[PDB]
Design a protein around this ligand. Structure first.
Ligand SMILES: [Mg+2]
Ligand SMILES: [Mg+2]
Ligand SMILES: [Mg+2]
Lengths: 120, 50, 241, 57
RNA sequence: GAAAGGGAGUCGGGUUCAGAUCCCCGAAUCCGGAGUGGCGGAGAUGGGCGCCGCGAGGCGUCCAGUGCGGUAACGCGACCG
RNA sequence: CGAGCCCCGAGGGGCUCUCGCUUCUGGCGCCAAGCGCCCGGCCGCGCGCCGGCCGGGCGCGACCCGCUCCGGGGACAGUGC
């Protein structure tokens, strides 16, 4: 005396959908991150324009992996050079390489950071 | 566009749910905006009634 | 007496053009799924068309009381399940190991099931009673069974639901079951069942053969035709006398 | 303003302190108030009229 | 399915051999976020009755309080849903 | 409500349109009022249908039954050879 159809449309009833509980992982182990920080930062750029950026804009110029975005570049530089960075500008060179202008924090000096990297 | 008859946009009340139903009647000559038109078996003979 | 004067009736009238209609039961006017429409239209077709007597005879099933007595009798002769068959086999193994031996011990009478088994029993005149479900969907497995049972002389009845026979035989579905020889204490109940069933099915086989089914119009058509008939009968009544 | 600028305007800049304010003009709000009142009065009148008319068989 | 349609919000100055509304300097602005609520402001903090108190003002109780102005167009910084 | 069809005792069934609530206005209209029956908790007459206060459910409101959603064709059209 309570089952009533107030709409002339029959909709498909809602049934529960179980979450997958596989009996074996399809891959034995996760594939490791190939794009770690050493892979992200390939080598610094040491041209005259890069040296001008170092001595003027407090900016280090790197050649990075093409698949690395600004967040990844920032974290990679922060980890493997122990410096705080203000911002990252990214372009892709006509030869296909990706170039990152990393502007450091004001309390970090690009000149002696480049010295301890070895690109003075 | 494409036809010579004007079209009448008429708004009705939905009899079963709270909503306004808009139709696109073909304008019988003499009807005007702001006019009530009546549709059904018990409607009276007036220009625009259905 | 203490009722708040602010309370009042606020009745809404559901005439045409007035307050919008309440959410009422629309089950008659629902756009149903295609499978529901198909099964309902099949049910309607089985009443529209002329059902031949060989198919229509299965609409005559046992009444609920007679079916209750029949199933209550048949519950004493259900086939043994897998677990109790294991128990009996283990008991026989223990007994033969120590120390009685073969010991058939009078393999008890049991209800035989399956259309092929029942057909063979009927052809051999070994079955004492045949019970046929009324709703075998591929209806060719059992259409010959009433005629075959009547010719061989074994009493047969038609019962509502193959699911009940399946529950008798610990399965989902059984077309037919057969009563072969029975225990002495149940011989009297089986005799009464056979008497009633033979009165209802085997004795009136001649007009079971001729009772066609279906050929019934819809309620709207019947009402319209009766309306025409009354429309002319009301004036023929004044015409006469 | 453009429609997406209205998302950063305050509430007061997008309406007028009146019923239907910022959606309907004042003249037609007055017309609707009068129309509603007078049509409900007319319904009362016709109800009273049929009530006094049905007093005879 | 539009680098010409719809589509929030960046401008001024300087700078290179070659880049800039993108870099530097300086002024802004849009969108999203803030669970532990960042600070203010608004809501919202008034009347009545008994008392105390020279008056002002304090105490207790009871009752309000989802803002306000203009005849109006409409306005005010918010203004539950 | 109705013309009252017809019995009329002025009751009233068989008997017809009605087995209807919307036409002077460029408003509004949903998420049920009301009634009835119950199920909890609170304090509590502290005798039970029993004092009242905070919640929840069902039914009537919104008639019953039914076998094609409603209507128009139709053994024709159409399709295959
Ligand atoms: Mg870029
Ligand atoms: Mg464009
Ligand atoms: Mg240039």
């Amino acid at each position: 005396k309570k089952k009533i159809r107030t709409s002339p449309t029959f909709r498909r009833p809602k049934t529960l959908r179980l979450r997958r509980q596989p009996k074996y992982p399809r891959k034995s182990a996760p594939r490791r991150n190939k794009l770690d920080h050493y892979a992200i930062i390939k080598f610094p750029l040491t041209t005259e324009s890069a040296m001008k950026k170092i001595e003027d804009n407090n900016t280090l110029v790197f050649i990075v992996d093409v698949k690395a975005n600004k967040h990844q570049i920032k974290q990679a530089v922060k980890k493997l050079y122990d410096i705080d960075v203000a911002k990252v500008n990214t372009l892709i060179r006509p030869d296909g390489e990706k170039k990152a202008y990393v502007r450091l924090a004001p309390d970090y000096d690009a000149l002696d950071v480049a010295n301890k990297i070895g690109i003075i | 566009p494409g036809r010579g008859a004007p079209l009448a946009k008429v708004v009705f009340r939905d009899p079963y749910r709270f909503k306004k139903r808009t139709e696109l009647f073909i304008a019988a000559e003499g009807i005007h905006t702001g006019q009530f038109v009546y549709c059904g078996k018990k409607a009276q003979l007036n220009i625009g009634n259905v | 007496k203490v009722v708040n004067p602010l309370f009042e009736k606020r009745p809404k009238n559901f005439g045409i053009g007035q307050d919008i209609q309440p959410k009422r039961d629309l089950t008659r006017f629902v756009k149903w799924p295609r499978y529901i429409r198909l099964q309902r239209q099949r049910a309607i077709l089985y009443k529209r068309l002329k059902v031949p007597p060989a198919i229509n005879q299965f609409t005559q099933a046992l009444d609920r009381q007679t079916a209750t007595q029949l199933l209550k009798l048949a519950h004493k002769y259900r086939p043994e399940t897998k677990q109790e068959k294991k128990q009996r086999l283990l008991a026989r193994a223990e007994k033969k190991a120590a120390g009685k031996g073969d010991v058939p011990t009078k393999r008890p009478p049991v209800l035989r099931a399956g259309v092929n088994t029942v057909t063979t029993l009927v052809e051999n005149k070994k079955a004492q009673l045949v019970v046929i479900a009324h709703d075998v969907d591929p209806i060719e497995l059992v259409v010959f069974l009433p005629a075959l049972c009547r010719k061989m002389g074994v009493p047969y009845c038609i019962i509502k639901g193959k699911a009940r026979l399946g529950r008798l035989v610990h399965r989902k579905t059984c077309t037919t079951v057969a009563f072969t020889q029975v225990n002495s204490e149940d011989k009297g109940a089986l005799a009464k069942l056979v008497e009633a069933i033979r009165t209802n099915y085997n004795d009136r086989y001649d007009e079971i053969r001729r009772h066609w089914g279906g050929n019934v119009l819809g309620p709207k058509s019947v009402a319209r035709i009766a309306k025409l008939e009354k429309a002319k009968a009301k004036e023929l009544a004044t015409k006469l006398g | 303003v453009r429609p997406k600028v209205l998302m950063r305007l305050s509430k007061t800049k997008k309406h007028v302190s009146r019923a239907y304010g910022g959606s309907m003009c004042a003249k037609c709000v007055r017309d609707r108030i009068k129309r509603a009142f007078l049509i409900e009065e007319q319904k009362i009148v016709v109800k009273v009229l049929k009530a006094q008319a049905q007093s005879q068989k």
